[PDB]
Design a protein around this nucleic acid. Structure first.
Ligand SMILES: C#Cc1ccc(C#Cc2cn([C@H]3C[C@H](O)[C@@H](COP(=O)(O)OP(=O)(O)OP(=O)(O)O)O3)c(=O)nc2N)cc1
Ligand SMILES: [Mg+2]
Ligand SMILES: [Mg+2]
Ligand SMILES: [Mg+2]
Length: 539
DNA sequence: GACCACGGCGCG
DNA sequence: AAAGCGCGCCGTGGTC
């Protein structure tokens, strides 16, 4: 490409190099643009940012986030990563997409700009005739990248002093647990080392091994194994408690306070748009889609996520979302009827689990039923179900039989999905998002059946993802108009931040936008709460 | 300092 | 662990 002076003409593709992968923390080291067989290299990257009308190119969102950080309203536009990811969601990295579709991902901005241009041309041609993928790109993914950029640049407020205080308390409890474990073992060891623990449990204390690890065949010390050994030796419960506390401390309590951005005073995640096989987003650096909530200490951690003073958090979560999606995809009359009648399958399974009438099912019971319902749907064994519930194998087998007998078109939908997947090589969501699953044709049963479970999960999980993404795209401009902010997405949940006086109106509007995103054979229902912290906003 | 595979586990 | 699926991050053990 012929070198031409900065600035480039409009519509040019950008290339940029960051000192580190996270745009909220990166120094913009270089910036370039490419168009019309010219490459324009910026003498001074930061000032040159002010010349662009939009970020168009590989990882466009990341440059947009950095621009927003610097107070520039630079929206992301076309991005070849999004085209590639829609063609095949195994296309997750610029390194791989470049190799597959026409170049090499290097560490120079000019080359990245020229690459973005070249890859866009080739990938755009590959989507020709692919109207459903094209619709996903234009109506969902491309606009969503703009929304995600704003979310990343906005961040979420964290009560740092609270977490610092919590760390000191948890450390003291961890010490009590570890000391008791060493007392019971007869000697100290590194309790964080599963290899050392294996030797203590199975060689020294002579507890029965229960399961093996996947890749190396060691005797497993997983929580499931420890659960089954809970009554074999007093050390086991102590280990389980130690595991819970150290997991929460090392992953959330300690690292999060150190990630507050100096300028914004907030915590900023990255919403990765081309990272999953199903069409879900992911979140990283830090992952804010896995903040604890299911246990008491976990709930204490979630309380650290708070609204700006004078504002409130609004949390909205789709009800029974993958079951509703399954009703639509499978067309099962019974499943459809459940939702037309306003019933709750989580509550119903909890009723059976705890042997109480539906009226007596408390929120804790209902929530315990969730992993059971989705586990069973997506192929969990009777052995596992019986172990997890401490019921006879025969009763677990019966539950699984009844579950599918209750919704007889579900198995029919699964079989149709797998047959079509074997023939075409891919399965698809309601909107036509694809996932290639070649191992449906594997000659090894273990491999093939694992591939089958992946394959029939994808249309359900992926359709739910498509719906949430479309809802985000519809909702964002409404929030801007009301002076509210979109902060986080957690798969079927959004967390927003609204001025106190407007929080009620924002809640109502967001609920309606999400429920009406795309009418199905069953209604979509959204649960919405408002509060000063993330825990209180989900009730 | 950094990379990795692994086991393990937090969320959806 | 076990026929649930989808993620990212932690510490260990082992390099490099
Ligand atoms: C306390 C607590 C507690 C919280 C969450 C869960 C869970 C879950 C799961 C979720 N999923 C997939 C399928 C779900 O439809 C989807 C959204 O997860 P949730 O919002 O937790 O479940 P839901 O929308 O089905 O039910 P709600 O009505 O929102 O409770 O993610 C899934 O595939 N597998 C799961 N185990 C277990 C315990
Ligand atoms: Mg939900
Ligand atoms: Mg949820
Ligand atoms: Mg792994």
């Amino acid at each position: 490409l012929e070198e031409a002076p900065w600035p480039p003409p409009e519509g040019a593709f950008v290339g940029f190099v960051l000192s580190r992968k996270e745009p909220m923390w990166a120094d913009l080291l270089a910036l370039a643009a490419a168009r019309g067989g010219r490459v324009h290299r910026a003498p001074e990257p930061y000032k040159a940012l002010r010349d662009l009308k939009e970020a168009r190119g590989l990882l466009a969102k990341d440059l947009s986030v950095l621009a927003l950080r610097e107070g520039l309203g630079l929206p992301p536009g076309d991005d070849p990563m999004l085209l590639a990811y829609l063609l095949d969601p195994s296309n997750t990295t610029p390194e791989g997409v470049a190799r597959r579709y026409g170049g090499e991902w290097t560490e120079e901005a000019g080359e990245r700009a020229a690459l973005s241009e070249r890859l866009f041309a080739n990938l755009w041609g590959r989507l020709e005739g692919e109207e459903r993928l094209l619709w996903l790109y234009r109506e969902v993914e491309r606009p969503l990248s703009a929304v995600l950029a704003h979310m990343e640049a906005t961040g979420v407020r964290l009560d740092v002093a609270y977490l610092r205080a919590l760390s000191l308390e948890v450390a003291e409890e961890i010490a009590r647990l570890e000391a008791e474990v060493f007392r019971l073992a007869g000697h100290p060891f590194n309790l964080n080392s599963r290899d050392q623990l294996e030797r203590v449990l199975f060689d020294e204390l002579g507890l029965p091994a229960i399961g093996k690890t996947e890749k190396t065949g060691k005797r497993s010390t997983s929580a499931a194994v420890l659960e089954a050994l809970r009554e074999a030796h007093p050390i086991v419960e102590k280990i389980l408690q130690y595991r819970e506390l150290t997991k929460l401390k090392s992953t959330y309590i300690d690292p999060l306070p150190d990630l507050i951005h100096p300028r914004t005073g907030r915590l900023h995640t990255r919403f990765n748009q081309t990272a999953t096989a199903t069409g879900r987003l992911s979140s990283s650096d830090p992952n804010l889609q896995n903040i604890p909530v299911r246990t008491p200490l976990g709930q204490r951690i979630r309380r650290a996520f708070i609204a700006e003073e004078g504002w409130l958090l609004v949390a909205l979560d789709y009800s029974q979302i993958e079951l509703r999606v399954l009703a639509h995809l499978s067309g099962d009359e019974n499943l459809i009827r459940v939702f037309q009648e306003g019933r709750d399958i989580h509550t119903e399974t909890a009723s059976w689990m705890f042997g109480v009438p539906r009226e007596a099912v408390d929120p804790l019971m209902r929530r315990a039923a969730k992993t059971i319902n989705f586990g069973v749907l997506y192929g969990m064994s009777a052995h596992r179900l019986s172990q997890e519930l401490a019921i006879p194998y025969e009763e677990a087998q019966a539950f699984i039989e009844r579950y599918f007998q209750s919704f007889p078109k579900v198995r029919a939908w699964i079989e149709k999905t797998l047959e079509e997947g074997r023939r075409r090589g891919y399965v698809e969501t309601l909107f036509g998002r694809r996932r290639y699953v070649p191992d449906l044709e594997a000659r090894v049963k273990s491999v093939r059946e694992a591939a089958e479970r992946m394959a029939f999960n994808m249309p359900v999980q992926g359709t739910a993802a498509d719906l949430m993404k479309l809802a985000m795209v519809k909702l964002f401009p409404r929030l801007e108009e009301m002076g509210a902010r979109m902060l986080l997405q957690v798969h079927d949940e959004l967390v927003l931040e609204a001025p106190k006086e407007r929080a009620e109106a924002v809640a109502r509007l967001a609920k309606e936008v999400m429920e009406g995103v795309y009418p199905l054979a069953v209604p979509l229902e959204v649960e919405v709460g408002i509060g000063e912290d993330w825990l209180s906003a989900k009730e």
